[PDB]
Design a protein around this ligand. Structure first.
Ligand SMILES: [Cl-]
Ligand SMILES: [Cl-]
Ligand SMILES: [Mg+2]
Ligand SMILES: [Mg+2]
Ligand SMILES: [Mg+2]
Ligand SMILES: [Mg+2]
Ligand SMILES: [Mg+2]
Ligand SMILES: [Mg+2]
Ligand SMILES: [Mg+2]
Ligand SMILES: [Mg+2]
Ligand SMILES: [Mg+2]
Ligand code: NA
Ligand code: NA
Ligand code: NA
Ligand code: NA
Ligand code: NA
Ligand code: NA
Lengths: 186, 156, 154, 95, 140
RNA sequence: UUAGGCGGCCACAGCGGUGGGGUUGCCUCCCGUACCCAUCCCGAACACGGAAGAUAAGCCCACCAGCGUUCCGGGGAGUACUGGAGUGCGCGAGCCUCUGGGAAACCCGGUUCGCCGCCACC
RNA sequence: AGUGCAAGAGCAAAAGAUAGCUUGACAGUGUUCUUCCCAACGAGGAACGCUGACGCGAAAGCGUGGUCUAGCGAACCAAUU
RNA sequence: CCUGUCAAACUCCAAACUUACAGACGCCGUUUGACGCGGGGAUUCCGGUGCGCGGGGUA
C-alpha cells in the first residue's frame, strides 16, 4: 500500500476469516477437519480434506436443509447445531470418512457452545473425533430445554407465530431419531 | 603531501562514517557561488569536464575552486553569474604514519571520486565568458587533464 | 555442419577448453573435425572459439579433404570412392560428403575416424593472435574463408 | 571468516525480501513427499524449526524415509554422501 | 436510509486520573457500577516509577446506565465546539467522555470478518452536535 | 456463487473513490439477556435466545488508475557491467577489437481495482 | 516497539504485552548435521526421533530452557547418586 | 516545491558468473573393468611467477 517495502497480509487474514496459526496446528493431525461454522440464523458443519489447489469438502450439513427431514423450528440454536453435526457426521460416514479434528474457526472455545454441540452430533454419527466430554452441553440444553423453560416465563410466545407456543425439545428427539436410520442423502 | 599518494581509485570505497572516526573537516568553503538567489536562467552554460577517473583531495577542490571564482571577479563581487562545484569529498583517505606491521592507516583527509567525462564545475553566464578563463586556471590545480565544454551557447 | 580446425596448441589453454576440444575428437594442432550445428555443439565451439578455425565448407572442398585426409577407424587404408562404396552407405566420396553436410550421418557412423588430420597450411595461415574480422585466422569463417584454409591444409 | 558459527556469512540467504516477510503459508509446511522424490533444499527465513545447516541451501537431494514429521534427505556434499534431517517447510518438489 | 444512520451513544467513560484510589467509591455511586483500576506505563519523576500500579479508575457506561448518567452529567457542563472529536466524540469535566457512532459499528468491534468503518459512514463533528444538542441542551 | 462456507497463490489481490443490490434461500447490521458462557467495569466483545425494523455499514455486483504493485511495448541501451581471446593502444591509470551474455534509474504508452479449487445453494 | 547482553537475522489474531496456571530448565536411549565445506580427528553444540513420566489446552497441539548463531574443558584422582 | 552529491560493514532493483539435481548430445567404460570398495608403500605440509578478482601499503 505505502511503498514497495510494504507487507500485505494474506488475503484470508485481511478478510479476518482464517487464523493461520491455528490452521497449521490443525493440519498437523493429518486428519480431516470438522469445520464448525455459524451465522445469525444458521449453522454449518463441513468435513474438509487438504487439496493440491485448496481444501476439498467431502461431506457437509447446513441447519437449513434440516427441515428437509422434518425440522419445523428456528435454526440458530443448540438443538439445531447438534443435528447439523449429526447430519454432516452421517453423510461423512457415507463418504468413507471415519475420524476428524474440530476446527472451530475464529469462534471461542466456550463450554456448552454450539460448535461443541456440532462436535457432539458428528461424534454420535459415528465419526471419531478427539474431544472432551465435560466441555460439552448437558444433553438437556442440547435437546433445547433451556429454551423451553425460557418460554415458560412466557406471557408472550418466544416464537413469533412459528410452531408451538411452549416449544418442543421432543421435536428434537423425533428428528435425531429419524436421522439414525435409512432416509435419503444419508 | 603529493597528489601521487591519493589520486587513484584503486582502493575500496571507504565512506561509512558510522565506522570511521576522526575525519578532518573539508577545506571547501562553498559549492554555490555568484548569484545563488537566481536560478539557471542564463543564455550560456560552460562546464569543466574531467577527462579521467581520479580522486581529488578537498585540498585541490578548494584551491581549484578559489582560483576560478576568486578570478571570476573580473565580473565583480556581486556580478551576474552563478558557479557550481557539484562534487563532494566522500572518500575518506588514510596514511600509515611499526613499519608494515599493523599498517592500516589513520584518517588524514577526504577526496572526491570523479569519473572521466563528469563535469566537476558548472558556471552560468551571459555572453561574457571570462569563465572560460576562470577554468583554464581551475584545471590547473587538479590532477586530471580537463575539457572546457560549453553547452547552451550557439553565440560563437 | 561446420568443419573445426584446432590452430593453437594446448600449452596454457584452460583445461575445460582443452577438454572440449577433446570431446570434439581433436587432440592435436591441425586436426579437423566435422561438427553438426546444434545448440549443444554450438555452445561448445563458442567456448573453443579462440583456439580454432571453423565454418561451413563447400561440397567440393569437403570432398577434397575427405579424399586426401580421411581414415578408417583403424589402419592406413585410403578412403577413396571405392573404399567409401565397399564400406559405407554411400557410393562415392561425394555421396558421403553430401550426407555429412546435410548432417544425416557422421564419420564414425561410417566407420571413419572422426578426425581429419590435415597438413600445415601451404603458404601459412593469417595468424593465431587475431580473429578473422581482424585479418587473423581464428574464429568463424566464410564458406570461401574456411575453404581456403581447408584447401591449403588439404 | 572472523568466526566459525553456523550462521557465519548467512546474512543474505537467511533473510527475507521485505515483502516475503512474516509467517509463512501452512500449505507447504505440511506437504507430503515420498521416498525417492527429488527435493530442493532452501531455508524459509520465516520458519525457525526444521532447519538444516546453511551450507546446504541450494542442494537437491532425494527423500529417503522420514524421522518424526521431519524428513531425511540424502544429498552429496562435494564428494561426500550425507543425510539431512529437514522439515517440509524448507522443501520443494523438483520439476 | 436513515434510522440505520442516525447517531447513538456508545459508552461514556468516566475516569479520574489521580497520581497514585479512595476515589473509586464516588465513581461507583456517580455511575452505578464497579470502577476499574488504572495501571500506568513508564517510570517517571512524579514518584511514579512503578509500571503496574493503581493510578486512577474509569467506568464504561452503556445503554440506560449511560443516559441516566448523562441526564445529569451534561447539565453540569457548558462547553461545546472545538472541544469536539473528528469522529463526533467529546469529553468534558474528573473526566466524562462520550463515544458516539452509527448503527453498524459492531462490524469494527466484532471478532470474525471485522472491518474498519468507511469514512462516509463515520460520524462528523457537526452531525454529532446535532444529535446531542437535540437532546436537552445547547451547542457551543 | 440475487449476497454462503473452507481454502490455494499470497498486492495483478494494497490505499483511496463512484454507482447498484435484498417479503428469504442468504449474509449482515439489527432486537434481546432465563439459560451455557462472558467482561480485573461495562450482553461493547465473547456466549446464548430471537426476528420488529434496515440495505445506511459490512458483504456481493458493476466500475474509476490519483498512489502502491505485476507484466509488456517503445526509448534509455546492446549503453553500464561481464565469461573467453589478443606481440591491439596507452608513461601509466586505463582503454580498444573479436567472441559469448547483458542491467538499473528514468520518461512516454498499455496492463493491473485479483485469479483459481472444493462444497453448499432458485 | 519489544524479545536479558555484540552483530546480523526471525517474529503481530505472535516468537511481543498482560493475566492465570505450571516446573519439559524432566529421566532413559538414539538418528543426523556440526565442531573438522570438500575430506580423517575429541570434548562441546544443534536439529530431529523413540520410551517413560508430566504441564497446559476443548482439541489438533505446544513444552528436549530464554527466537537463531557466543557463555566452554581429556586422562588420572577426589566427592557425590 | 526546486536544486547539489555518496556507501566494504545501505538496498526498491540487478547481471555476467559460480553452483545442486535431472534429461539430452558429446566423450568415456563393460578382454584397456570405468564409477566405487578394501588394503600395502610413500612423498609432501619453506614455494614461485603470469593473467583476472582482490585486502593492506606512498610504493
Ligand atoms: Cl463461524
Ligand atoms: Cl544439515
Ligand atoms: Mg587410426
Ligand atoms: Mg614457407
Ligand atoms: Mg604469422
Ligand atoms: Mg555477503
Ligand atoms: Mg446500498
Ligand atoms: Mg527453541
Ligand atoms: Mg594431573
Ligand atoms: Mg564433587
Ligand atoms: Mg563466488
Ligand atoms: Na611494534
Ligand atoms: Na591538470
Ligand atoms: Na514468509
Ligand atoms: Na489489579
Ligand atoms: Na448494504
Ligand atoms: Na560430538
Amino acid at each position: 500500500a505505502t511503498g514497495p517495502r510494504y507487507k500485505v497480509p494474506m488475503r484470508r487474514r485481511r478478510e479476518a476469516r482464517t487464523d493461520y496459526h491455528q490452521r497449521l496446528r490443525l493440519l498437523k493431525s493429518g486428519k480431516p477437519r470438522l469445520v464448525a461454522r455459524k451465522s445469525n440464523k444458521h449453522v454449518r458443519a463441513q468435513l474438509v480434506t487438504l487439496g493440491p489447489n485448496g481444501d476439498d469438502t467431502l461431506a457437509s450439513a447446513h441447519s437449513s436443509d434440516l427441515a428437509e427431514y422434518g425440522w419445523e423450528a428456528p435454526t440458530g440454536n443448540m438443538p439445531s447445531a447438534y443435528l447439523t453435526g449429526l447430519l454432516a457426521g452421517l453423510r461423512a460416514q457415507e463418504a468413507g470418512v471415519e475420524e476428524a479434528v474440530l476446527d472451530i474457526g475464529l469462534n471461542s472455545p466456550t463450554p456448552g457452545s454450539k460448535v461443541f454441540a456440532i462436535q457432539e452430533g458428528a461424534i454420535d454419527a459415528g465419526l471419531d473425533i478427539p474431544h472432551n466430554d465435560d466441555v460439552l452441553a448437558d444433553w438437556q440444553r442440547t435437546r433445547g430445554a433451556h429454551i423451553a423453560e425460557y418460554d415458560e416465563q412466557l406471557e408472550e410466545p418466544l416464537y413469533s407465530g412459528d410452531f408451538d407456543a411452549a416449544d418442543l425439545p421432543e421435536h428434537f428427539d423425533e428428528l435425531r431419531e429419524t436421522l439414525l436410520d435409512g432416509d435419503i442423502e444419508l | 603531501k603529493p597528489g601521487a599518494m591519493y589520486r587513484n581509485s584503486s582502493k575500496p570505497a571507504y565512506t561509512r562514517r558510522e565506522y570511521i572516526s576522526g575525519i578532518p573537516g573539508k577545506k571547501i568553503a562553498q559549492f554555490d557561488m555568484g548569484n545563488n538567489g537566481a536560478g539557471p536562467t542564463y543564455p550560456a552554460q560552460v562546464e569543466l569536464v574531467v577527462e579521467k577517473p581520479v580522486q581529488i583531495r578537498h585540498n585541490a577542490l578548494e584551491a581549484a575552486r578559489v582560483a576560478a571564482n576568486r578570478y571570476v571577479q573580473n565580473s565583480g563581487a556581486a556580478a551576474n553569474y552563478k558557479f557550481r562545484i557539484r562534487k563532494f569529498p566522500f572518500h575518506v583517505i588514510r596514511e600509515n604514519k611499526d613499519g608494515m606491521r599493523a599498517p592500516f592507516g589513520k584518517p588524514v583527509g577526504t577526496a572526491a571520486r570523479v569519473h572521466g567525462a563528469n563535469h566537476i564545475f558548472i558556471a552560468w553566464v551571459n555572453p561574457d565568458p571570462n569563465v572560460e578563463e576562470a577554468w583554464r586556471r581551475a584545471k590547473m590545480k587538479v590532477t586530471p587533464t580537463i575539457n572546457i565544454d560549453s553547452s547552451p551557447a550557439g553565440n560563437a | 555442419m561446420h568443419a573445426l580446425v584446432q590452430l593453437r596448441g594446448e600449452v596454457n589453454m584452460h583445461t575445460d577448453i582443452q577438454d572440449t576440444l577433446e570431446m570434439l575428437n581433436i587432440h592435436h594442432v591441425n586436426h579437423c573435425t566435422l561438427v553438426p550445428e546444434t545448440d549443444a555443439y554450438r555452445g561448445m565451439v563458442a567456448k573453443v572459439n579462440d583456439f580454432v578455425a571453423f565454418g561451413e565448407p563447400s561440397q567440393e572442398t569437403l570432398e577434397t579433404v575427405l579424399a586426401t585426409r580421411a581414415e578408417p577407424l583403424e589402419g592406413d587404408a585410403d578412403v577413396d570412392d571405392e573404399w567409401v562404396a565397399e564400406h559405407t552407405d554411400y557410393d562415392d566420396i561425394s555421396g558421403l560428403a553430401f550426407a555429412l553436410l546435410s548432417e544425416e550421418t557422421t564419420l564414425r557412423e561410417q566407420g571413419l575416424s572422426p578426425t581429419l588430420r590435415l597438413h600445415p597450411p601451404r603458404g601459412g595461415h593469417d595468424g593465431v593472435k587475431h580473429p578473422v574480422k581482424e585479418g587473423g585466422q581464428l574464429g568463424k569463417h566464410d564458406t570461401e574463408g574456411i575453404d581456403d584454409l581447408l584447401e591449403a591444409m588439404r | 571468516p572472523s568466526s566459525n558459527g553456523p550462521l557465519e556469512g548467512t546474512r543474505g540467504k537467511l533473510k527475507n525480501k521485505p515483502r516475503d516477510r512474516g509467517t509463512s503459508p501452512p500449505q507447504r509446511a505440511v506437504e507430503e513427499f515420498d521416498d525417492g522424490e527429488k527435493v530442493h533444499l532452501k531455508i524459509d527465513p520465516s520458519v525457525p524449526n526444521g532447519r538444516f545447516h546453511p551450507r546446504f541451501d541450494g542442494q537437491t537431494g532425494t527423500v529417503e524415509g522420514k524421522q518424526g514429521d521431519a524428513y531425511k534427505v540424502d544429498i552429496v556434499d562435494g564428494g561426500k554422501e550425507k543425510t539431512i534431517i529437514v522439515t517440509a517447510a524448507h522443501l520443494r518438489r523438483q520439476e | 436510509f436513515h434510522e440505520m444512520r442516525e447517531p447513538r451513544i456508545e459508552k461514556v467513560v468516566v475516569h479520574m486520573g489521580i497520581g497514585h484510589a479512595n476515589a473509586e467509591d464516588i465513581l461507583g455511586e456517580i455511575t452505578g457500577q464497579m470502577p476499574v483500576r488504572t495501571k500506568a506505563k513508564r517510570t517517571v519523576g512524579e514518584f511514579d516509577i512503578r509500571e503496574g500500579d493503581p493510578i486512577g479508575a474509569k467506568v464504561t457506561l452503556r445503554d440506560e446506565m449511560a443516559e441516566e448518567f448523562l441526564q445529569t452529567a451534561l447539565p453540569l457542563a457548558e462547553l461545546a465546539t472545538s472541544q469536539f472529536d473528528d469522529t463526533g466524540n467529546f469529553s468534558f469535566g474528573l473526566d466524562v467522555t462520550v463515544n458516539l457512532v452509527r448503527p453498524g459499528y459492531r462490524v469494527a468491534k466484532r471478532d470474525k470478518a471485522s472491518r474498519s468503518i468507511p469514512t462516509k459512514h463515520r460520524l462528523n463533528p457537526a452531525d454529532a452536535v446535532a444529535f446531542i444538542e437535540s437532546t436537552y441542551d445547547v451547542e457551543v
